[PDB]
Amino acid sequence: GRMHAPGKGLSQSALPYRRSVPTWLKLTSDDVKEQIYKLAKKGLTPSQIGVILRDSHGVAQVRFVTGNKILRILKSKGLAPDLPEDLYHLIKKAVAVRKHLERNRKDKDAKFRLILIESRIHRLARYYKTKRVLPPNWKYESSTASALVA
Amino acid sequence: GKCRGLRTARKLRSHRRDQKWHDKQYKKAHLGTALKANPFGGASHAKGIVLEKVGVEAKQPNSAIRKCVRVQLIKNGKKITAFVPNDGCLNFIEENDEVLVAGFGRKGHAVGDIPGVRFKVVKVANVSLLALYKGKKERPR
Amino acid sequence: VRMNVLADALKSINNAEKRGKRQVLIRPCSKVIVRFLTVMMKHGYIGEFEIIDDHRAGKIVVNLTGRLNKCGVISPRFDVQLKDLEKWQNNLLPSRQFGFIVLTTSAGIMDHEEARRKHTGGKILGFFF
RNA sequence: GGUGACCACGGGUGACGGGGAAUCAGGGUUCGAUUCCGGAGAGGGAGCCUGAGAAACGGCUACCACAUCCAAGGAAGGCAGCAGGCGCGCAAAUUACCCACUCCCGACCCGGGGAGGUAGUGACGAAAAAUAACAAUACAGGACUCUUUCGAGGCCCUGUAAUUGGAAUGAGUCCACUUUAAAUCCUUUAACGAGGAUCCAUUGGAGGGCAAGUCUGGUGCCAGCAGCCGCGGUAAUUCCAGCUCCAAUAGCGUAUAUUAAAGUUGCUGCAGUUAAAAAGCUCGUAGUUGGAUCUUGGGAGCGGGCGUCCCCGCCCUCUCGGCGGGGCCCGAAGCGUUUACUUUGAAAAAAUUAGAGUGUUCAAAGCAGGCCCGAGCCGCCUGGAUACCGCAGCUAGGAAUAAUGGAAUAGGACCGCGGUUCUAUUUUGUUGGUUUUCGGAACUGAGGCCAUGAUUAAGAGGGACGGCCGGGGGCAUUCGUAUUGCGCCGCUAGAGGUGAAAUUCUUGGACCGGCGCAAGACGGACCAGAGCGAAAGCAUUUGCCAAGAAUGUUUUCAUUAAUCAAGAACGAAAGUCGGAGGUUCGAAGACGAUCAGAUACCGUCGUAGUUCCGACCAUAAACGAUGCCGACCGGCGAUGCGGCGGCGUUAUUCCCAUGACCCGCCGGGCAGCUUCCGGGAAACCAAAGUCUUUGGGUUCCGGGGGGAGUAUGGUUGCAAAGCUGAAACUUAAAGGAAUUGACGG
RNA sequence: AGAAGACGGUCGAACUUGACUAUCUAGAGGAAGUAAAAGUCGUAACAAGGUUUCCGUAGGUGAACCUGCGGAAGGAUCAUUA
Ligand SMILES: [Mg+2]
Ligand SMILES: [Mg+2]
Ligand SMILES: [Mg+2]
Ligand SMILES: [Mg+2]
Ligand SMILES: [Mg+2]
Ligand SMILES: [Mg+2]
Ligand SMILES: [Mg+2]
Ligand SMILES: [Mg+2]
Ligand SMILES: [Mg+2]
Ligand SMILES: [Mg+2]
Ligand SMILES: [Mg+2]
Ligand SMILES: [Mg+2]
Ligand SMILES: [Mg+2]
Ligand SMILES: [Mg+2]
Ligand SMILES: [Mg+2]
Ligand SMILES: [Mg+2]
Ligand SMILES: [Mg+2]
Ligand SMILES: [Mg+2]
Ligand SMILES: [Mg+2]
Ligand SMILES: [Mg+2]
Ligand SMILES: [Mg+2]
C-alpha cells in the first residue's frame, strides 16, 4: 500500500529471469560507461540516464551489462550529486507547494499535502543519516529549503 | 487485535492492570471507598444498641410488615437498620439492648422484599436469638 | 506488511487443504518454509513439492495428499525448553498418539519427538496434525 | 552536571522482606503479623558512658506525653519479655510447676535462666474412632423349590415386637503399676460398670436449583418464609406445628475476607455492525513488529541391525610436545565479532512440597529402628535418601531462528623489501672499556598478489519518466433563469392563503400580462447504488497555480517499511467576535387560525442567522453504528479509470493511426447478483470467513442496568462549552436478534 | 592528681511563627439523585403514536416538549419506467 495514500496499486517493472546480456547488444562495458558519463555531464539524474539508455540505445539493464549500478558508476568517478535524487525531488516538491501556499493561504489541501511531503522528507533524511549518506547534522529547514534545492 | 510480540510484556501487563479497574469487584476491593462506606468497617459482626423498633413494608408484589430495629453501632456510632428474622423474636428485643448484628447474606446488598436492610440480629442481650426462639434459654428477668 | 513468510505459507496450505485442492502455490519461499515442508513430508502429511526458482524469493508448489487436518503456526517464536515441552504438546497437539510440534533447535529444524530424542530445545515454529 | 513515557519525582498502602500458605488441567489469583533467616523498635524524638561488639533501654542524660509517692523540701518511671489486668473491640488462655530434657551464661563437672520444658483454658484446625453385634420365633421378599396360580419349607437377606436371650465390650467409678523434676494424660491391669442397653446425636432441610411429603391441624397477602426464582388473601407439598423422610455426622448452620466456578480481566484464552464497545479523519516521535539471501552435498570399521536401520567418527592455528634437537607424545596462548537461545556442570540453609525406607497398634505424624539371646549376645545390622528451588550471575558444549558487524572517495587483507627511536641481556671472567648492528621495537616509502572487495532487486516501499483521468483544492473570470423590489404600459375588483378560514395587500390601480433595471443568493433538468478527496465535503463556462490515485515501465535507491503514547494539520451544521451585505428562507417574537386548553403542528409578517472576508469553537446517527497494513479462500454479469489485444460498423481523406461503438484480457476502484466456502445468537456477512483444529503485525477501546458523562480536580475557550473524569447510593434485570399472537388514525 | 564552672564549635530534643502536603470532619442554607405510590396536570415515545423518529447545535415554553440549521435511517422507500 502507498505510504501516504489509500492506494494499493501494482504498477512496477518486472525484470526478466535471463540475466545475460542480449546477443544483439553490441555496446561493450566501457561503451555503456562513457555514454553514461556524457548524459550525466548534460545534467541528468541516474533515473533518467537509465531511461534514455534503455530507450534509445536498447540496453536492457546497466547493472547487467556493466556489472554495476548507474549511481555506483557515477559515484565511483565522482560526478554524482551529494544530495540523493529521490531526496532532491522531495525537497523540490515541498518548495513548490510552499511557494504556492504563500499566494493561496486558503488552500487547506495544499497545507495537508505539504505535511505529507515534509514527513516523507524527514523519514528519508533519517534513513540517509543512518547510512552516512547525509551529514549527522544535516537538517531540512522550511526556510533554507529553497537554497538547499536548485 | 492484541499484540503478541516477544517484547510486549510491559504493554500487556500495563493494559491488564489498567483494565482491571473496570470491573466492580476489583474496583471496590482496592479503591477503599467501599471499606470506608461500610458501617461494619470490614467486620463480619458488630455490636450496637437498639434505638427503637421499626416496621418496614415489603416490596410491590409482596405485602407484609418486616420487623426491624434501628440500631447504632457501639463503634463509630453509625445508625443502621437490622432485621429480626423469626416469627416472634421482636418481642424479645426491647429499648436499649446490646445486639450483635451480622450482614444479611449478600455483602451489603438488600435481600428479598425488605427494602434497604443489609443486616440482621444474631444475639440480643448477650443471649442468642435462636436460643430465645427455641426456648433453650431465656431473657435475664 | 508481510512480516511472517512461514505464517502465510502455512495458512495458504491450510486453506487449500480445507478447500480440497490437489495443489497449492506459496508465493514467498524461504529456508524455514522448505525445512518445515520437509519435516511434514517425511512424516507423510504432504507429498512432493517443487521450488520454482526465480531470481527473487522463489515460489513453491506443494502436492496435497488430503491427510492434513491443521498446519498452524506459532508466530512469537517462544523459547521452549525440555521441561516445558510437554505443556506445549498438551496445548497444541490433538492427542498423545499423533500430531507434531515443529521447533527449530541448534541441531536444525525438527519435530518435537526428534528434539526430545536428541535432548535439545529451541524456538517453537508451529505445529501440524 | 545527574535522573526521567524502558514511568523519574511525588502520593497511597488496611506494606516489614524472604523461605512459604490456600485454590489446584495448564496458565494463573490471593495470602504471607505468626515459631526459620534477615531487618526495625522498645511511649515519641535526640545525645551519650562502658565495653571487642550498643547510639543498649529489665544502661544513663535532656525535652515532649502520660503517670507514681511526698511530711510539698524532694524522689522514682517504661510489661511491643512470662503471667495477670484496664481500654478497644466481632475477635484470642493460668498473676500454675520446673531447670528433668534442648541449649545459653558464668571464675564453673556443682549456680542461674517466665529461653525453653510440663501441666491448665482451648470444637482455630488436623489424624483415629463408640452410640451396638449375634441367634431362633412369627409375616412379607428372593432366580426360590416341590403339583402347571391354589399349599408347604429341603434354602438366602432385610424389616417390624417380643418373657426374647445370653454372649462382648467400652463411657464411666476405681486399686496398683507406669510415665514424670514432682505430677497429669495415654498404655497395662485388679474390682464394679448395658435391654427403653433412659449410658437418649445433633445441626440444617423436604416446590425448583438440590437429596427428601401432591400426610394432618392452625394461620389466611396477616404472621412469617424466602441466598435466587418465588410462597402466603380459606383442603399452603414453601409459613406455624405434629408425624414421616433427606443430607452430613461428633459435628452442622450463619456472617464476612479470599480462591475455583470466571473463557464474567481472557499470555494460554474474551469481546467491539445490531447486545457494553473502533477515536470524525490524517500525519507522527517514543513503543511494538519487520521480505528473501551467505555450508549444501558427499565419507571410513566401530554403527537407533556397508549389515546402503546408521550408537556415530564429522571423510582452529601454533608454543615448551614433560611419556637448542627421539618417533615412544598431548600442554602454555588467542578466537577468523558481539549477543540472544538451548543443553550440561558448579554454587544454590533448614523446615515446608513431592518422594525412598520404616506396622506410630492404623493414620495424621515422627525419624526412627531390625536381628538373634541357645542368658553371657560379657552385641551385631542398618537408616537418617533423592527430586524441585523461578529470574539474575558462573562454566563448558551446539550454532538452526533473531539482532548486530568487516573491503566503497579503499586512510582494505596477506607476503615480503626500503624508511626511524630505545631497550632484556654476555662471559672481549683481575677491574675499566665492552662492538654489544648484538636479539627486538619505535615512525614509514616503493611493490607483488588477493577471481581483489558492492547478494538479488520483494505481486515491500520511496523517487524519476510517459500518456491520460477525476462535482479533488485555491485564485481570478463567465453565464443562467428564478426570487424580491423598483420604473413606464393595458384592462379589471379582487389578490394571497387554508381542510375551512383569518391576519395581510388591494379603484392610491393589488394580482395578472409586457418592456427594462438593480440586488444578493443558488448552480435544476443532464445527475447515475457514477467520479474525486484523509475525512468533513466537492456540480455554470474559461484561464492560472501547485497537488494526486490508477495504469504503463527490462528506469533509479536498496529495506528506506506497518501501526502508533506524547504532539500536530484539517474538520458539516449550529454558535461567538469584528467588518461588509442583506434576495430568499427563517430560530426568537407578534398576530391570525385550531383545540377543553395550544406557550405547537397550519397561515401572515418578522429579529439573530442564512452570504463573503478575518479570528475563534472542535462537536454530529462526523454511520459502513463495522481500525489500519499483509496473506489466503467460490462463481457470474455489469460499471469508472488506465493499458493490451482482436470480427466488424461509423468520423474525414489519400492509407494508417486516432476518436464513437462491438468482442475479450490485465490491474486498481465504487458497487451488484448468486452460492450448504465458512462464520454468527440470528438478522445477515465473500467478510463480520480462514476461531476450543484457538498465535500474521500493530493501535484504540468494552466489562450487568442506573447514578453519570454527574460531582470534584486540572486544562482549553470571549462565552456557549470541549477534553480528562469518579464515588456514595440504588436495582434483578436492563438489553440484542428472531417467532407467534394482538393491535394500528 | 585533680571537682564544680565558663568561652567557642558540633549534634540536637523541644517550643513559636510561616509554608507546603495528606486524610478525617462540623455547617445555616441550596441544589440533585434514588425508593416508595395509590396523587394532580398533560400525553412526549412505542402503529405513519395521530407533526416519522433520533443525533449535534442554538433559542424558547408549566411539564413532558416546540422550533430553526445541518445530518442519519435504527423509516413509513432496498424499485418508478423516454
Ligand atoms: Mg505497617
Ligand atoms: Mg512474615
Ligand atoms: Mg534496637
Ligand atoms: Mg568487654
Ligand atoms: Mg535508646
Ligand atoms: Mg450418647
Ligand atoms: Mg414443614
Ligand atoms: Mg472465585
Ligand atoms: Mg464477555
Ligand atoms: Mg451499541
Ligand atoms: Mg514510531
Ligand atoms: Mg528474515
Ligand atoms: Mg386579503
Ligand atoms: Mg460552520
Ligand atoms: Mg457578524
Ligand atoms: Mg417571510
Ligand atoms: Mg496488527
Ligand atoms: Mg457498567
Ligand atoms: Mg433561593
Ligand atoms: Mg414528537
Ligand atoms: Mg410524533
Residues 6+ apart with CB under 8 A from B128: B122, B137
Nearest CA of chain A to the CA of C35: how many Å? 25
Beta bridge partners of B56: B66
CATH number of C69-129: 3.30.1490.10
CA distances from C13 to A94, C28, C30, C122 (A): 47, 13, 15, 24
User: If you measure from the C-alpha of residue C15 to the centroid of ligand 8, how many angstroms do you get, rounded to a whole number?
Assistant: 41
B contact chains, 3+ CB pairs < 8 A: C
CA distances from A5 to A1, A2, A112, A124 (A): 8, 5, 12, 17
Phi, psi (rounded to 5 degrees) for A34: -65, -30
Rg of chain B over Cα atoms, rounded to whole angstroms, equals 21
How many angstroms separate the CA of B50 from the C1' of E8? 71
User: If you measure from the C-alpha of residue B11 to the centroid of ligand 11, how many angstroms do you get, rounded to a whole number?
Assistant: 15
Cβ contact B57 with chain E strand, < 7 A: yes
Residues of C with Cβ-Cβ distance to B6 under 8 angstroms = 76-78
C contact chains, 3+ CB pairs < 8 A: A, B
Residues of C with Cβ-Cβ distance to A63 under 8 angstroms = none
Number of domains forming the structure of chain B: 1
Cell numbers placing A18: 535471463
Other C-beta atoms closer than 10 Å to the C-beta of A134 total 20
Domain residues for B117?
Answer: 1-141
Nearest chain A residue (CA) to C53: A17
Cell numbers placing B93: 428485643
Cell numbers placing B53: 423498633
How many angstroms separate the CA of C91 from the C1' of D22? 27
Q: Is A77 helix (H, G, I), strand (E, B) or coil?
A: helix
Query: How many angstroms separate the CA atoms of A122 and A117, rounded?
Result: 9
Tell me the pairing of strands C100-105 and C122-128.
antiparallel
User: If you measure from the C-alpha of residue A135 to the centroid of ligand 10, how many angstroms do you get, rounded to a whole number?
Assistant: 54
Beta bridge partners of C60: C26, C51
Nearest alpha carbon to residue B101 among B79, B59, B73: B73
Closest-lying nucleotide for A12 based on CA to C1': D553
Residue type, C122: G
Q: Is C121 helix (H, G, I), strand (E, B) or coil?
A: coil
Nearest CA of chain A to the CA of C55: how many Å? 6
Cell numbers placing B81: 437498620
Beta bridge partners of C126: C73, C102
Evaluate whether B101 touches B82 at the Cβ level (below 8 Å): yes
Cell numbers placing A83: 544530495
Cβ contact B79 with chain E strand, < 7 A: no
Q: Assign domain A81-150 to its CATH architecture.
A: Orthogonal Bundle (1.10)
The domain C1-68 is placed in CATH, from the list 1.20.1290.10, 3.20.20.70, 3.30.1370.30, 3.40.50.300, at 3.30.1370.30
Evaluate whether B81 touches B119 at the Cβ level (below 8 Å): yes
Q: What is the 3-state secondary structure (H, E, C) of C40-106?
A: HHHHCCCCCEEEECCCCCCEEEEECCCCCCCCCECCCCCEECCCCHHHHHHHHCCCCCCCEEEEEEC
Nearest CA of chain A to the CA of C118: how many Å? 43
Interchain contact, C78 vs B5, CB within 8 Å: no
Closest-lying nucleotide for B104 based on CA to C1': D255
Beta bridge partners of C59: C52
User: If you measure from the C-alpha of residue B30 to the centroid of ligand 2, how many angstroms do you get, rounded to a whole number?
Assistant: 22
Sequence ranges of the domains in chain C: 1-68, 69-129
Q: How many CA atoms within 13 Å lie on the side-chain side of A89? A: 7
Evaluate whether C120 touches C106 at the Cβ level (below 8 Å): yes
- Give one DSSP letter per residue of C9-46, joined into a string: HHHHHHHHHHHT-SEEEESS--HHHHHHHHHHHHHTSS
Residues of C with Cβ-Cβ distance to B4 under 8 angstroms = 75-76
Residue type, B137: K
Residues of A with Cβ-Cβ distance to C55 under 8 angstroms = 15, 17, 19
Q: Is A119 helix (H, G, I), strand (E, B) or coil?
A: helix
With an 8 Å CB cutoff and a minimum of 3 pairs, decide whether chains B and C touch.
Answer: yes
| Residues 34-93 on chain B lying near strand D, CB distance under 7 A | 34-38, 41-47, 55, 58-59, 61-67, 73-76, 85-88, 90
Q: Is B71 helix (H, G, I), strand (E, B) or coil?
A: strand
Instruction: List the alpha helices (DSSP H) in B4-120.
Output: 9-19, 24-31, 33-37
Q: Which residue has cell 527473487? A: C56
